[PDB]
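Appendix B, Record 12. Input sequence as logged:
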Amino acid sequence: MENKIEVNNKDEMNKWFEEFKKGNGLVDTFTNSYSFCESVPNLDRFVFQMASATDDAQKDSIYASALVEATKFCAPIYECAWVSSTGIVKKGLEWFEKNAGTIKSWDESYTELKVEVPKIEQLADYQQAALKWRKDIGFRVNANTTALSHKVLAEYKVPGEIVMSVKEMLSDMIRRRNLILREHVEWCREFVKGKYIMAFNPPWGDINKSGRSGIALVATGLAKLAETEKGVFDEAKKTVEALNGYLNKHKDEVDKASADSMITNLLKHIAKAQELYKNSSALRAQGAQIDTAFSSYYWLYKAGVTPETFPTVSQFLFELGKQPRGTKKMKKALLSTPLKWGKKLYELFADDRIYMHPAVLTAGRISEMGVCFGTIPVANPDDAAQGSGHTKSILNLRTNTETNNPCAKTIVKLFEIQKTGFNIQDMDIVASEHLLHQSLVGKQSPFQNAYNVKGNATSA
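Logged structural output:
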């Protein structure tokens, strides 16, 4: 035992899902994919618990229980099964041991990436290797399991009473949102200090020389503006005004047209460096997002799981799935099991803000693997009716305008919860906002890739 989900292709998937469905009784009532969701999870009790106000910041435990409640019966069975099916677990594991060159930049930088901020392209190769990944195995079987795609939601329809609460959430997301606004590079170091004279004969040549399109100067500052980080741009600035008054002082030893053109040139350059910096810091934010399937499978490959061995993992996350056990037990059990993969997975763990990188395992992020593999016990899928809640299952919750409001209500519920436990503007991350965040970009499913999606966090 023994992955029961012997499915290699869509047509098998379809067959398996039906065999499954009668045997167990699904109504896609409040879910986008058939759930065990019979009514809407109710978290009321948790509000009142939260007020209880222990000091052990748990709280954390309360929130985890709410979460559990939200997620327990609403897993996208069809999709979850496909992601755990035999066909997908082979191809999906085999892909890594075959696309090693494609991953290096974050792979060989896993140890360091465990503590240190990723390169701009550690991010971009991940995202790119994600899609390459999804495409090469045939991860495509549905719309819940496609890459998006098009555009962000411009409007979000919410039933009257949560309309407000949601927008409080929105304003917060906004602020949080808006906190964000090799040799030539060295030459730039010399220059930004305050040395102005540098500017009469740069190495690459002229001060207006471009690399492969843009002013080298700008490209340089931009780069140095993020290893040594206002700041630098303001230096460029002072040293430039310094230059001005130098040129004013020796006007008579200087060509007039050339000297003024020099100031606007560099001034124009420094404003482009700013822009560029900005653009990468947006690029960054963007490249932050985990691709649930891909990232989870990467850790599978990382811990040294094999198909043969996968049902043990699935089981384990399933088991993890009803427990309010904290990370402690979660660690104690992984360090304990005779399964070799167990110590490897733990070892992957990080703990020493965000910027982490979407490809770095952590204790919380176990939840990713949970959605992928722990909602249904591969060794015996009927135990799935017992209900095993993982965070992302929450996007199986309907958002249909008119009636069915589930998704936002649940998340809203969870936000209130978070709210009553702690100061809401003053925590570093806001779990519920991330969820609301993911609904707003239009994910209908945990198994979607949202990276190609255009548009913002603007409400309305």
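Residues 392 and 448 are 11 Å apart (CA to CA).
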